[PDB]
Ligand SMILES: Nc1ncnc2c1ncn2[C@@H]1O[C@H](COP(=O)(O)OP(=O)(O)NP(=O)(O)O)[C@@H](O)[C@H]1O
C-alpha cells in the first residue's frame with residue numbers, strides 16, 4: 498500500500514496509476530475522464546507555461562482570453578459527439594443550446610475579419626491559456642487523454658505563406674525545447690500524412706514521443722499551416738500593399754497537460770516519480786539521521802537549507818519527528834525530489850554530508866563548503882542524464898525496415914518502424930531529419946518510387 502507495488506515493465510498500466518496518485522500528482526474524480534491536478538502536477542504546468550510564454554512573446558505573440566461558451570449556430574458554421582452542451586440555467590432551459598469549447602477556431606476566426614482590414618493589421622498573433630472539453634469516446638487516461646484538459650492554443654494570420662510557414666516551425670521547435678529543456682523528454686519533429694493531418698490544415702507539423710514499455714507513440718504537440726482554408730471559410734481577407742484583396746495565411750498550434758503524462762511515463766521508475774529539476778518545486782530534500790545531540794543535527798541541516806535557499810534553490814528540510822529516516826528516504830523518492838541530502842553524526846563529524854541523486858541513486862560525501870556548488874552542477878547533470886537515457890530508449894525503439902516481415906517483427910517487439918514513403922499501426926509522421934534515400938528505392942506495398950522515410954507505429 499505504502500509504495501509502488503507494480504513494476505513499470507511488468508504492469509505498466511497499474512504502475513502508472515500508482516505513481517500519479519502516490520506521488521501526489523493527481524486525485525481521481527467522480528466524473529470519468531476528469532482528474533484533480535494537485536500542486537505537484539500543476540507546478541509542472543506552471544513551469545512550462547512560464548517558459549513557453551517567454552518564448553512566444555519573443556515572436557510577438559500576445560495572450561488573450563476568448564469565451565468558454567460558443568452558440569450552436571456559430572460552432573456549426575464528424576466531431577459532434579464530443580461536444581458538451583449546456584442546456585439549462587437553473588431549472589430553466591436556454592432558448593438556444595450553447596457548447597463548451599473543444600477548441601477556439603469558430604470562436605476566434607469569427608472575429609478575425611473585424612480585426613483584419615489591410616496589410617497593416619498583419620500579422621495577427623494570438624494565444625490562449627485555457628481549458629477545453631471533449632467527451633472522449635476512447636478510454637480516458639490521466640494527463641494523456643482527459644475529457645477536460647488544460648492547454649495552450651495559438652492562432653496567427655499572416656500576409657503570405659512564407660511568414661506563416663516559418664512561424665509554424667518556429668513554434669514547433671519551442672515545443673521541442675519545451676519537452677527537452679524542462680521535461681527532459683526527447684521528441685521527433687515531423688509532418689503528418691494527408692490522412693492523419695488536421696482536416697482544416699494545409700499541412701500538420703507534429704512532435705512525437707514514444708513509450709517503450711507499452712510500445713505506443715504519443716503526439717506531444719501540434720503546429721498547423723492552415724493556408725487560406727479557414728480564411729476562405731470565415732471570409733478573413735485583407736487589402737494588399739497593392740490595393741488588391743487577399744486571403745490571410747493562418748497557423749494554429751497547441752500543447753496540453755498530456756506533456757506531464759509523457760514526462761511521467763518517460764522518467765518514472767519502480768521507486769516512483771522522477772522529476773526533472775526544472776519542474777520540481779523542491780530541488781533538494783534534507784533528511785536528518787539520529788542515534789547524538791539532536792539539536793546539533795537540526796542546526797547543521799537548517800544551515801544547509803539556508804545556504805541553498807539564499808542561492809535561490811528551493812528545498813525542504815524534513816524534520817518530522819514521528820518518522821524514521823528510512824521512511825523519509827522513500828517518501829521523497831516517491832515524490833520525485835531530484836536530490837536528497839543526508840546528515841548524520843558521521844557527516845556532522847567531518848563537517849560534510851551525503852548527497853543522493855534520484856535518477857541513478859549515486860551517493861557522494863561533500864564538504865559543507867562545497868554543498869552549494871556540487872548541488873548546482875548535480876541538478877544540471879541529472880537533467881542531462883534523464884534526457885540522454887530517454888533519448889537512447891527512443892532511438893533504440895526505431896527500426897529501419899524495407900519489407901513486410903521486418904515490419905511484423907518490429908510490431909511484435911513493440912518497436913516503431915522507419916519505412917520508405919511514396920505519397921493499430923498507423924503513419925506517425927514524416928521526420929524532418931531525413932536519412933538518405935537510395936535512388937532506386939520502392940515502397941514494398943506499392944512498387945512506386947520512394948521519396949522520403951516515414952515513421953510508423955501504434956499510438957495513443
Ligand atoms: N483529451 C486530451 N487530453 C490531453 N491531450 C489531448 C487530448 N486530446 C488531444 N490532446 C493533445 O492536444 C494536442 C492537439 O490536439 P488536437 O489538435 O485536438 O489533436 P486531436 O485531433 O484531438 N488528436 P486525437 O484526439 O488523438 O485524434 C495534441 O498534442 C494531442 O495529443
Ligand SMILES: O=C(C[C@H]1NCCC[C@@H]1O)Cn1cnc2cc(Br)c(Cl)cc2c1=O
Nearest residue numbers: 576577579580599600650695719749750751
Ligand atoms: O483542435 C484542433 C486543431 C487545433 N486547434 C487548436 C490548436 C491546436 C489544435 O491542433 C483539432 N480538433 C480536435 N478535436 C475537436 C473536437 C471538436 Br467537438 C471540435 Cl468542434 C473540433 C476539434 C478540432 O478541431
Ligand SMILES: [Mg+2]
Nearest residue numbers: 576579631633
Ligand atoms: Mg481528438
